Scaffold this active site. Structure first.
Site, short mmCIF file in Angstrom:
data_model
loop_
_atom_site.label_atom_id
_atom_site.label_comp_id
_atom_site.label_asym_id
_atom_site.label_seq_id
_atom_site.Cartn_x
_atom_site.Cartn_y
_atom_site.Cartn_z
N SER B 133 0.84 -1.20 0.00
CA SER B 133 0.00 0.00 0.00
C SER B 133 0.87 1.25 0.00
O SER B 133 1.79 1.36 0.81
CB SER B 133 -0.86 0.00 1.25
N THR B 172 -9.03 5.93 3.33
CA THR B 172 -9.20 5.25 4.62
C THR B 172 -8.47 5.94 5.77
O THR B 172 -8.59 5.53 6.92
CB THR B 172 -8.72 3.80 4.54
N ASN B 199 -8.20 1.51 -5.44
CA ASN B 199 -9.38 0.86 -4.86
C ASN B 199 -10.68 1.35 -5.51
O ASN B 199 -11.58 0.56 -5.74
CB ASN B 199 -9.46 1.10 -3.34
N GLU B 247 12.35 -8.54 -21.27
CA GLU B 247 11.74 -8.29 -22.57
C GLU B 247 10.51 -7.40 -22.44
O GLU B 247 10.33 -6.46 -23.20
CB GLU B 247 11.38 -9.64 -23.19
N1 GTP Z 1 -7.48 -3.82 -2.37
C1 GTP Z 1 -7.14 -3.78 -1.10
N2 GTP Z 1 -6.79 -2.63 -0.56
C2 GTP Z 1 -6.44 -2.74 0.78
C3 GTP Z 1 -6.46 -3.92 1.46
N3 GTP Z 1 -6.08 -3.72 2.77
C4 GTP Z 1 -5.83 -2.42 2.85
N4 GTP Z 1 -6.02 -1.77 1.65
C5 GTP Z 1 -5.71 -0.38 1.38
O1 GTP Z 1 -4.63 0.01 2.22
C6 GTP Z 1 -4.56 1.45 2.24
C7 GTP Z 1 -3.94 1.97 3.56
O2 GTP Z 1 -2.77 1.23 3.89
P1 GTP Z 1 -2.79 0.28 5.22
O3 GTP Z 1 -3.82 -0.83 5.05
O4 GTP Z 1 -3.16 1.14 6.43
O5 GTP Z 1 -1.30 -0.21 5.03
P2 GTP Z 1 -0.44 -0.76 6.26
O6 GTP Z 1 0.90 -1.16 5.65
O7 GTP Z 1 -1.02 -2.02 6.91
O8 GTP Z 1 -0.25 0.53 7.15
P3 GTP Z 1 0.20 0.37 8.63
O9 GTP Z 1 -0.89 -0.21 9.51
O10 GTP Z 1 0.49 1.76 9.11
O11 GTP Z 1 1.41 -0.49 8.81
C8 GTP Z 1 -6.02 1.90 2.10
O12 GTP Z 1 -6.13 2.90 1.09
C9 GTP Z 1 -6.79 0.62 1.81
O13 GTP Z 1 -7.86 0.80 0.87
C10 GTP Z 1 -6.82 -5.18 0.78
O14 GTP Z 1 -6.83 -6.30 1.25
N5 GTP Z 1 -7.14 -4.98 -0.50
N1 GDP Z 2 7.64 -16.47 -38.05
C1 GDP Z 2 7.78 -16.39 -36.76
N2 GDP Z 2 7.89 -15.20 -36.19
C2 GDP Z 2 8.03 -15.27 -34.83
C3 GDP Z 2 8.01 -16.41 -34.06
N3 GDP Z 2 8.15 -16.10 -32.71
C4 GDP Z 2 8.23 -14.80 -32.72
N4 GDP Z 2 8.15 -14.22 -33.96
C5 GDP Z 2 7.97 -12.78 -34.33
O1 GDP Z 2 9.18 -12.11 -34.70
C6 GDP Z 2 9.73 -11.50 -33.54
C7 GDP Z 2 10.88 -12.39 -33.08
O2 GDP Z 2 11.62 -11.89 -31.97
P1 GDP Z 2 12.26 -12.95 -30.89
O3 GDP Z 2 12.65 -14.15 -31.74
O4 GDP Z 2 11.12 -13.10 -29.88
O5 GDP Z 2 13.47 -12.13 -30.25
P2 GDP Z 2 14.63 -12.97 -29.57
O6 GDP Z 2 14.09 -14.23 -28.93
O7 GDP Z 2 15.22 -12.03 -28.54
O8 GDP Z 2 15.61 -13.20 -30.67
C8 GDP Z 2 8.62 -11.39 -32.50
O9 GDP Z 2 8.37 -10.07 -32.07
C9 GDP Z 2 7.38 -11.92 -33.22
O10 GDP Z 2 6.62 -10.89 -33.83
C10 GDP Z 2 7.83 -17.68 -34.72
O11 GDP Z 2 7.71 -18.80 -34.25
N5 GDP Z 2 7.74 -17.56 -36.09
#
Ligand code: GTP
Ligand code: GDP
Ligand code: TA1
Ligand code: TA1
Ligand code: GDP
Ligand code: MG
Lengths: 426, 430, 426
Positions: B133, B172, B199, B247
């Site tokens: 958070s 919160t 959130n 990548e």
């Molecule tokens: N999506 C989500 N948000 C959460 C959850 N729990 C807390 N939050 C968010 O956490 C934010 C605040 O941070 P805290 O929960 O107080 O974080 P903390 O690290 O536990 O803070 P401290 O108690 O001071 O140690 C709020 O904006 C909440 O909405 C969760 O399980 N899910």
């Molecule tokens: N024809 C062909 N093209 C591919 C294939 N896989 C990836 N490519 C395409 O050509 C590019 C190849 O780059 P890549 O081989 O992934 O890079 P590298 O692994 O770092 O050498 C990709 O961005 C794809 O668009 C394959 O099996 N066949």
């Protein structure tokens, strides 16, 4: 080698399209998986016209599928042949067109067309030599009418010399499902008269008349209507897919079929059509195919041709048949019915003859009429439009998309100009 | 090889420790009596004796008995070596000077003797893990006493530090500002990487993500331990990209004094929701950049990022991670410094996050810990040095600190050194 | 007979290395025990190139394994092939490099290099005629970058006339895992430009682009990246391990590939690569291998070659194929793409043809590009380095290892000198 690009728009265009792809896949012997399973080399020789080759000898159809809603893509993709199409070629929005032309053309589809058109480029650049575009849509509602004619405008500007060839299901009074149908169609016909090289005018009233008065179906569905449309779609391209005694490309049709540039609103038909319980009693032969094909009950638009004259008719026959017998019947028709053909053209009938008839029949004929009787289809839409528009009804849904009242006035003006040019040659 | 010595200080550090060691025992399969039923994975955190008893490499320190007497009586009484649970007689009273100068002065040379007896059992020790958070008397004063010793005794070794830090409003104690400012010399001079935690930030994470309406500290500590398990997971397990502890630093730390990263974890989630969320790698990456998941009440958007280590674990793949960080680089609200063009160090490890069985936090296939050096943390320092200034202008409690052996001038010398750190984090953002 | 000594550094170098030893053991038909179990005499004919014979006809690979951490040795030794390597050849530290070059070079690896180098002597003295050193490493991080370049310096001073040949995985901005990556690489490139005879520049961004846009893997791992690298490592040495119509040693590559001494930063590729579900639809043949191999999506560094010109390309083919067809395609490419090759070299393509294709495919091609477009890899590292270094950020991790600030200034100086020499021939 003379590739076609095919495009499907809205619910109707994707439904007549998704049936068309089941029909030409049966012809070319393509499995629902896309694998080839056919008998013959001739099925494979021109498979490139509608398909792309892919790995394992799978064939992928050159369709683009367009909608402003996911639900028709979901219905096609899950359907009888849905797995065939390219996943990238399903192009769609999320919010629909609201049955509004101005949402299709200015807002919801104007956002989406940039995503459509760039797929039409991928398919057209894969072609060796593109001959044209084959677009399926409806003129009622908002996706096919307003986005499909936006897309025609964009593809026309980009491909000015290729054939633009559209199959266009359109409104009539006794078979209607939309209040604003007349508006959407009048705004859409204004784009078709300027941009397309051919438009095949199709009607649900005429497609129900074939189902009741010819096929004797008790309960015809939209799946049965879509089957009649797609038979004539397979029909007109046959001569670039199969060999024949007389070959006719879509351009060889257009040069013979369109006397003056704007008179390209055709009216299709098909033969033989027989009542399902009656086939064994009928003789399939060229003069019976003719006596069906040239009769007013067979054509797929509500226009009775006895209310006008034909400019040109094309009869694209398929099967092993005599050129004397074809040339005899296409003479006998226009001499015995001479009051129904224009008398400033010395022969009104184009013929073509393919060596390969549809799977399961010995012969077939696809009919294409150009006739001054198509004035009646544009007239009745124009008078339904007028009766709403005199009281500005429903216009806040279109002007809310930033459309002018002046664009309605200018669309109905251009509609009466199309009515007047057919009535001029009457 | 690869050892780490974990030091748990005051009540917050010990109670975080009682959660860390609760986790590490479950994660390595060690019983609370230190035995292991049936690989050297435990070796980073546990020494093994010939009886087959694993004894933790930990020291628990408190200046008062109460909290560690409870560790000595509860379930872990048999885990720890009895002389590495270390207690005094006297509480530090929330007074830094009792912890550092007066009371802790007595226990320190016993605390070091345990750390020596742990380091002599390592072979290549990797570093130290120090838990505390900032506000406590033991949290500030005893950690600062201990770190000064470890930084002369183990000068080369990396010192990683986990700090519960005062909040904006929650407190919160009256004297929490005094204890925290007096701690700033510890973290600056005698630490290598310092993980501040708050959130009040965890209380809000608990309310929004775990849906617990009224948590205790057991709920906080179970989150704070989970981060350190995830920092160390590459040291402990197999991975795709294991990260070495240096990548990590070579990528986190840009300058010698700039080693205060934020940390965050994802997914924090309850069993009510974990079965309906995807929890894909993209989502749990993006969750680390939300102000909502930072465990210090400061806004990262009021800073700039210097470097991020994304340390993934469980079922993840380098595809997914690169695709994720590419979206983070695309977002203009997440701003890095001009001098870090790379920004991200990635690690990936195959071991999933261990559930504490009594806990609120659910079972999940994946987690990430993001550890992130950013200029924003200077606001948590600007809060607390303004609490300090009001009290030191009166000398308001100073007689308790002066009365226990502190120089009065250390309060001025600590407020001065904090102002030089708060200067350094503002200076490098430019 | 032209033995190679192989060295692995850091996580990446041992991972690309430990996969390479699984690949060439499959080729040479060696069991994970080290016993020979192959089909063919050709597998055994040159087994000495990468292995030592030991008692009972067990083969021990001539690797040295170097790391500053045990965890990668543990991961290799326990791995799929880990038991193959000599226990004495695992040389390692305990504390890692921290991702720091200066840990590698001055501290953590300077301790270890005396234990590495004396193992490199035991393997090189067991050779009949050593041709060179083959070192695997990364330039990010600290082991491979800083120890591996220390080891290059030590082996270069001891073996001045043998080929030094390095495979070098190196940084890029969009795929990064390290904050200090720019520093490590800039310090490491300064050693590679002076000492190596060839360096094969490899990037994780380009290795992920192959995995998503070609193979259609949903989740590519580093194990999948290491498999792409090690296919090209097996590729370039093929012509000293197997017979062929045109043989090319690593030196026959270097004489043709390196016009001016320092321009040896190559950029590898491999074909055929196909989506796992699509193989049956593809035709394996020389013009399809070519249309993959020479396309910007296939190369294993982020540099689009359309941002420079090639100096030299080497195409090392494997399989039963025509020399006319190979020589036709390697002509057609550099004439139809002539704007992408330097016009002061009259033919920019080296060809080689091995008779033995990889196990399970009918043909294969390993591609090596040298191109002025590699300036972009050195430029972006140099500008990331500069933006950190102007504020001295992270330098205490390097100066903490006793490194000077002057060594950073001198490394980035030598980096811009390498950028300038490639940009000079643009
Ligand atoms: N999506 C989500 N948000 C959460 C959850 N729990 C807390 N939050 C968010 O956490 C934010 C605040 O941070 P805290 O929960 O107080 O974080 P903390 O690290 O536990 O803070 P401290 O108690 O001071 O140690 C709020 O904006 C909440 O909405 C969760 O399980 N899910
Ligand atoms: N024809 C062909 N093209 C591919 C294939 N896989 C990836 N490519 C395409 O050509 C590019 C190849 O780059 P890549 O081989 O992934 O890079 P590298 O692994 O770092 O050498 C990709 O961005 C794809 O668009 C394959 O099996 N066949
Ligand atoms: C034994 C027999 O005579 O079978 C015929 C049949 O009975 C009749 C009634 C068929 C049948 O047609 C229908 O039932 C039908 C129903 C609603 C709408 C349209 C058709 C037939 O189903 C249809 C089928 O036609 C085809 O298969 C064509 O190649 C056609 N393609 C498809 O119908 C098709 C069906 C499923 C999947 C894919 C394609 C076609 C048409 C034009 C261009 C290309 C292909 C045929 C010969 C028959 C049956 C099977 C009963 C008829 O259709 C055709 C196209 O020939 C309807 O009138 C004709 C006359 C036929 O005699
Ligand atoms: C029936 C069939 O066609 O199987 C193929 C296969 O389907 C495909 C998809 C394989 C397959 O590759 C992969 O799955 C893969 C995944 C990530 C990274 C790299 C590869 C295959 O696994 C890889 C395998 O290749 C080899 O075995 C080579 O010899 C290769 N060595 C290894 O892959 C290897 C694997 C395990 C242990 C040791 C070596 C090699 C490459 C270069 C130089 C020397 C050797 C093959 C033919 C196939 C499968 C099995 C499906 C492919 O790979 C190769 C090298 O041919 C991926 O694209 C090709 C095209 C192949 O058609
Ligand atoms: N032939 C046929 N007509 C349809 C089908 N679905 C709808 N239609 C009809 O034609 C019109 C098509 O409009 P629609 O495609 O719904 O508008 P859109 O989705 O906005 O383009 C509807 O009002 C129906 O009367 C179908 O599957 N086949
Ligand atoms: Mg306390």
């Amino acid at each position: 080698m003379r590739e076609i690009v095919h495009l499907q728009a809205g619910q109707c265009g994707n439904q007549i399209g998704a049936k068309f792809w089941e029909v030409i896949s049966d012809e070319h012997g393509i499995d629902p998986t896309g694998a080839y399973h056919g008998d013959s080399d001739l099925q494979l020789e021109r498979i490139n016209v509608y398909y792309n080759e892919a790995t394992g000898g799978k064939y992928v159809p050159r369709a683009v599928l367009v909608d402003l809603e996911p639900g028709t893509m979901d219905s096609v993709r899950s359907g009888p042949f849905g797995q065939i199409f390219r996943p990238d070629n399903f192009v769609f929005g999320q919010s629909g067109a609201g049955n509004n032309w101005a949402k299709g053309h200015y807002t919801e589809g104007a956002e989406l067309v940039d995503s459509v058109l760039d797929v039409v480029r991928k398919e057209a650049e894969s072609c060796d030599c593109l001959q044209g575009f084959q677009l399926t849509h409806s003129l009622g509602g908002g996706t096919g009418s307003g986005m499909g004619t936006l897309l025609i405008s964009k593809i026309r500007e980009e491909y000015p010399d290729r054939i633009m060839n559209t199959f266009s299901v359109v409104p009539s009074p006794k078979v209607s499902d939309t209040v604003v149908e007349p508006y959407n169609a009048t705004l859409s016909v204004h784009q078709l008269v300027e941009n397309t090289d051919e438009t095949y005018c199709i009607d649900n009233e005429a497609l129900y008349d074939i189902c009741f008065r010819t096929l004797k179906l008790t309960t015809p569905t939209y799946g049965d209507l879509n089957h009649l449309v797609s038979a004539t779609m397979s029909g007109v391209t046959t001569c670039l897919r199969f060999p024949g005694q007389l070959n006719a490309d879509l351009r060889k049709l257009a040069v013979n079929m369109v006397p003056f540039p704007r008179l390209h609103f055709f009216m299709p038909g098909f033969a033989p059509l027989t009542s399902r319980g009656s086939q064994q009693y009928r003789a399939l032969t060229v003069p019976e195919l003719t006596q069906q094909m040239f009769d007013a009950k067979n054509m797929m638009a509500a226009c009775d041709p006895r209310h006008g004259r034909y400019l040109t008719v094309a009869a694209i026959f398929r099967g092993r048949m005599s050129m004397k017998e074809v040339d005899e019947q296409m003479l006998n028709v226009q001499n015995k019915n001479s009051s129904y053909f224009v008398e400033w053209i010395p022969n009104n009938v184009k013929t073509a003859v393919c060596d390969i008839p549809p799977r399961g029949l010995k012969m077939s004929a696809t009919f294409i009429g150009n006739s001054t009787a198509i004035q009646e289809l544009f007239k009745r839409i124009s008078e339904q439009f007028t009766a709403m528009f005199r009281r500005k009804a429903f216009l806040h849904w279109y002007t809310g998309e930033g459309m002018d009242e002046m664009e309605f006035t200018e669309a109905e003006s251009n509609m009466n100009d199309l009515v007047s040019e057919y009535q001029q040659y009457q | 090889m690869r050892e780490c010595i974990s030091v748990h200080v005051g009540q917050a550090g010990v109670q975080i420790g009682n959660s860390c060691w609760e986790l590490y025992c479950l994660e390595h399969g060690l019983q609370p009596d230190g035995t292991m039923p049936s690989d050297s994975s435990f070796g980073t955190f546990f020494s093994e004796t010939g009886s087959g008893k694993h004894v933790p490499r930990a020291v628990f320190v408190d200046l008062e008995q109460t909290v560690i007497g409870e560790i000595r009586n509860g379930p872990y009484r048999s885990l720890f070596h009895p002389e590495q649970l270390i207690t005094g007689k006297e509480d530090a009273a929330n007074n830094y000077a009792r912890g550092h100068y007066t009371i802790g002065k007595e226990l320190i040379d016993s605390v070091l003797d345990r750390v020596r007896k742990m380091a002599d059992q390592c072979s290549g020790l990797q570093g130290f893990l120090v838990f505390h958070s900032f506000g406590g008397g033991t949290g500030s004063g005893f950690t600062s006493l201990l770190m000064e010793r470890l930084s002369v005794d183990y000068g080369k070794k990396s010192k990683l530090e986990f700090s519960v830090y005062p909040a904006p409003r929650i407190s919160t104690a009256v004297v929490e500002p005094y204890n925290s400012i007096l701690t700033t010399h510890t973290t600056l001079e005698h630490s290598d990487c310092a993980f501040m935690v708050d959130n009040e930030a965890i209380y809000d994470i608990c309310n929004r993500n775990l849906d617990i309406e009224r948590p205790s500290y057991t709920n906080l500590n179970r989150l704070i331990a989970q981060i350190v398990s995830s920092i160390t997971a590459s040291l402990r397990f197999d991975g795709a990209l294991n990260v070495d502890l240096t990548e990590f630093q070579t990528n986190l730390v840009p300058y010698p004094r700039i080693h205060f990263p934020l940390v965050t974890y994802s997914p924090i989630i309850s069993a009510e929701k974990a079965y309906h969320e995807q929890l894909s790698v993209p989502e749990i990456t993006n969750a680390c950049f939300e102000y909502s998941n930072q465990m210090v009440k400061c806004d990262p958007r009021r800073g700039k990022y210097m470097a991020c280590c994304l340390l993934y674990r469980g079922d993840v793949v380098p595809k997914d991670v690169n695709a994720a960080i590419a979206a983070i680089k695309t977002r203009r609200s997440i701003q890095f410094v001009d001098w870090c063009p790379t920004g991200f160090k990635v690690g990936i490890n195959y071991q999933p996050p261990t559930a504490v069985p009594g806990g609120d936090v659910a079972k999940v296939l994946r987690a990430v810990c993001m550890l992130s050096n950013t200029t924003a943390i200077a606001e948590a320092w600007a809060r607390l040095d303004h609490k300090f200034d009001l009290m030191y202008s009166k000398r308001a409690f100073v007689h308790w600190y002066v009365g226990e052996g502190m120089e009065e001038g250390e309060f001025s010398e600590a407020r001065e050194d904090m102002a030089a750190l708060e200067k350094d984090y503002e200076e490098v953002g430019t």
